[PDB]
Write a protein that binds this DNA or RNA. Structure first.
Lengths: 171, 471, 49, 48
DNA sequence: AAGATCTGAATTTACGGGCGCAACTATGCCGGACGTAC
RNA sequence: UUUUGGCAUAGUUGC
DNA sequence: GTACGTCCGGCCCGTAAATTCAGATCTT
């Protein structure tokens, strides 16, 4: 889930970037570094809302690099377990369904799909269709899925969705 | 009662020492220098020392005098304490055997024919020989053609053969050996040896339930392990007290969606997640593939380590390199540039990979290794993969989603799209410059200049090659 | 072998008893000048003891 | 020593084996023990 | 009064440290057992 | 196509 | 039958603790 939290990061600034625009360079380099990355403990980071305080630049006494601590208020999405979450199915395959929840890519496995749904290999657009045809699962549809569990690999989170519980799927 | 005293003896000669001491006692039992000791003990498995029964240490010393084998215990002797004298005499205890002596020591031997003579038995063996080629060795199949070709002590009777010290073989050694030279109790060979010729596994941290008794349906984490009656110490849910359970009462139960590894069977080595636990059929998906694997509850363990699931460049021949796609016990499954998966021996050569090699895609954009490139033409059109190795006109692509060959395939580079000196050690003559007239030997040479060890002076100097003239 | 070892190493006593063996009794003869050789041949040693 | 355990051999031999194990471990940490020999490599040279 | 025991206060062995660096030459495991060849 | 190495005893010697 | 060759078994110093003697708080 999404949280606007203060976070600590450390930046090694090279001596070429001193002079004016130093702190602006630190801001820009923080934005280049933290954005576009996921972590296991705090999930994805979407963007830095602001910088709370730039710490004192300590000179490392063998290098000339300057270590800057930065407190920064940023928005992070942390996928938690045991939550109904809104999702958009992005890819539909035989083995499972891929959905997007913000930055996160959730994988609904074939066993986790209810047994009332069956893959449609006879349709040119592949889909999971119900035995009675009350919901059709294709790409780009608004569903509500339960997170079975968050699983982290290479500091990138992919979770498992389920539709077994009531009030889930297409509504 | 008398007491036992330890006397150090020559190793491997304790029974002979006992016999010699008995003969010494009997010889001098009527003389004026009697042996006042009572008995001598040389146990069957106690090697290095013997025991003397006497009321005094001085009696032991005066009794072992003249016995060289006990000279290392002559100066001092150590008494056996009183409570422990019952342990000195305490003794304990188409088949398969294992030979005791010879080069076939501790090697599996199928008892082919048992001779009722109670002297020797016929044994089937795998020969550990070099076929009279190195001597003037691991187990391998008997090659009669090789020993016929090499000659030497060899007599051939079709499949039957005599050779190299009256070793008898047929089709496999078939030789008579002494029964006392083999062990008939405690061999228990394996399935591999069957081809050549219950169990409890609980570990700390695993989750186990209770299948029977008044403490049924209590799931807890294993702490300790023992052999048969474990008396386990499981940390149950909502219980601070530790209870006791044997191995038989427990079962390796695991909740849905937890790390699972296979300990043994056809599915061993694979990790993954269980989806639904039935009464005994536990179904799981592997971390590598999304295939259904059905296992017994006992063949599951709770380990959180990531799956292993490598990919080296090897030379199938100087005209075609190869990329290993699977490691096997005696072979490599290798994928070449032709797209043909082959099975080759371990003894291909390791090529120097060019990690800085540059290749051109279908759109004349420079590409390198570790680049995610889409395949827009060829047999693999539609797939997208990471470049791992490069050639003049080929590129190997990895893809985790593709389960075949560990994700490795190959495509031509043009069907992709990005998403010493001769003068060294030569006697030379400086024919020009301030150093004219000097003979030297060339140490280092370049396109412009060359170092010359000067023969005369204690110095090496670099000069232009135009100033040098070879002798 | 004992005489050869003792004169080769300068350790005096049994080879196994090198711990208690007086050392440096036999030295490599010095060959820099004739005077050095002569002085080495006429040398006396005072052990610490 | 482990062999003598899992077969269940005599106890005095286990005690003497424990004595020699204690000596070996102490010489491994510290090769200076009063009234006991210095560890040698069967060549009469004290071990570090 | 006595008499202890009895508990703080003078005399004997035992580790255990023992100058910087630097350079050179000099020396350094075997004995029984099992088998091969002759 | 770019290598590598005994060590730890004793002696002697230099400031 | 014999032996040999070669692979497997066996001075200080300060501390410091251990050894020796008159309160003391008892018992008579």
């Amino acid at each position: 889930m999404f949280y606007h939290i203060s976070l600590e990061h450390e930046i090694l600034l090279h001596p070429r970037y001193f002079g004016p625009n130093l702190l602006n360079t630190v801001k820009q380099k923080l934005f280049t570094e933290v954005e576009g990355t996921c972590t296991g403990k705090y999930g994805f980071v979407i963007a830095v809302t602001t910088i709370d305080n730039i710490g004192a630049g300590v000179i490392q006494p063998g290098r000339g690099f300057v270590l800057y601590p930065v407190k920064y208020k940023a928005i992070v999405f942390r996928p938690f377990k045991g939550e109904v979450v809104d999702a958009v199915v992005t890819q539909v395959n035989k083995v499972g369904l891929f959905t997007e929840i913000g930055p996160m890519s959730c994988f609904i496995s074939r066993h986790s799909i209810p047994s009332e749904m069956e893959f449609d290999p006879n349709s040119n657009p592949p889909c999971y269709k119900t035995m009675d045809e009350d919901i059709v699962i294709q790409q780009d549809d608004e569903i509500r899925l339960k997170i079975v569990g968050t699983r982290v690999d290479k500091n990138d989170i992919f979770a498992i969705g389920s539709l077994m519980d009531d009030y889930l799927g297409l509504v | 009662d008398p007491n036992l005293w330890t006397v150090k003896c020559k190793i491997g000669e304790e029974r002979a020492t006992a016999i010699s001491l008995m003969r010494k006692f009997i010889a001098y039992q009527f003389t004026d220098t009697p042996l006042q000791i009572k008995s001598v003990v040389a146990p069957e498995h106690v090697k290095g020392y013997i025991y003397v029964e006497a009321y005094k240490q001085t009696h032991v010393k005066q009794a072992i005098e003249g016995v060289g084998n006990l000279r290392l215990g002559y100066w001092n002797q150590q008494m056996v304490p009183i409570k422990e004298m019952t342990d000195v005499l305490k003794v304990v205890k188409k088949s398969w055997v294992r030979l005791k002596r010879g080069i076939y020591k501790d090697d599996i031997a199928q008892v082919d024919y048992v001779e009722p003579s109670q002297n020797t038995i016929s044994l089937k063996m795998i020969p550990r020989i070099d076929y009279d080629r190195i001597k003037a060795p691991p187990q391998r199949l008997f090659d009669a053609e090789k020993i016929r070709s090499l000659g030497g002590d060899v007599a051939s009777d079709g499949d039957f053969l005599i050779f190299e010290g009256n070793r008898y073989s047929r089709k496999f050694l078939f030789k008579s050996f002494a029964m006392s030279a083999v062990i008939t109790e405690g061999v228990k060979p394996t399935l591999s040896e069957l081809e050549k010729f219950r169990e409890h596994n609980f570990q700390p941290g695993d989750n186990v339930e209770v299948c029977e008794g008044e403490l049924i349906n209590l799931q807890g984490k294993i702490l300790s392990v023992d052999g048969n009656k474990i008396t386990i110490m499981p940390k149950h849910e909502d219980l601070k007290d530790m209870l006791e359970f044997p191995a038989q009462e427990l079962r390796k139960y695991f909740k849905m969606g937890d790390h699972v590894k296979v300990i043994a069977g056809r599915f061993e080595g694979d990790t993954g997640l269980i989806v639904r636990v039935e009464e005994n059929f536990v179904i799981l998906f592997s971390d590598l593939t999304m295939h259904e694997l059905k296992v017994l509850p006992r063949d599951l363990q709770l380990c959180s380590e990531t799956a292993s699931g490598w990919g080296e460049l090897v030379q199938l021949d100087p005209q075609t390199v190869g990329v290993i796609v699977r490691l096997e016990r005696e072979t490599f499954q290798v994928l070449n540039m032709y797209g043909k998966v082959v099975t080759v021996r371990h003894q291909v050569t390791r090529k120097k990979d060019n990690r800085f090699a540059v290749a051109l895609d279908s759109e004349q954009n420079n590409i390198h290794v570790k680049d995610i490139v889409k395949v827009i033409d060829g047999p693999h059109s539609g797939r997208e993969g990471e470049i791992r190795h490069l050639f003049r006109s080929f590129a190997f692509l990895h893809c985790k989603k593709l389960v075949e060959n560990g994700g490795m395939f190959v495509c031509k580079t043009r069907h992709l799209v990005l998403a010493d000196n001769e003068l060294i050690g030569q006697t030379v003559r400086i024919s020009q410059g301030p150093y004219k007239g000097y003979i030297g030997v060339v140490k280092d040479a370049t396109e412009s200049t060359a170092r010359v060890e000067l023969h005369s002076t204690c110095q090496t100097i670099s000069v232009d090659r135009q100033r040098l003239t070879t002798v | 072998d004992g005489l050869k070892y003792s004169l080769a190493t300068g350790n005096w006593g049994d080879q196994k008893k090198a711990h208690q063996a007086r050392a440096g009794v036999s030295q490599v003869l010095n060959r820099l000048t004739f005077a050095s050789t002569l002085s080495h041949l006429r040398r006396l040693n005072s052990p610490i003891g | 020593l482990r062999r003598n355990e899992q077969n269940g051999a005599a106890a005095h031999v286990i005690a003497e084996d424990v004595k020699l194990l204690q000596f070996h471990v102490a010489t491994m940490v510290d090769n200076e023990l009063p009234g006991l020999p210095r560890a040698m490599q069967k060549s009469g040279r004290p071990l570090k």
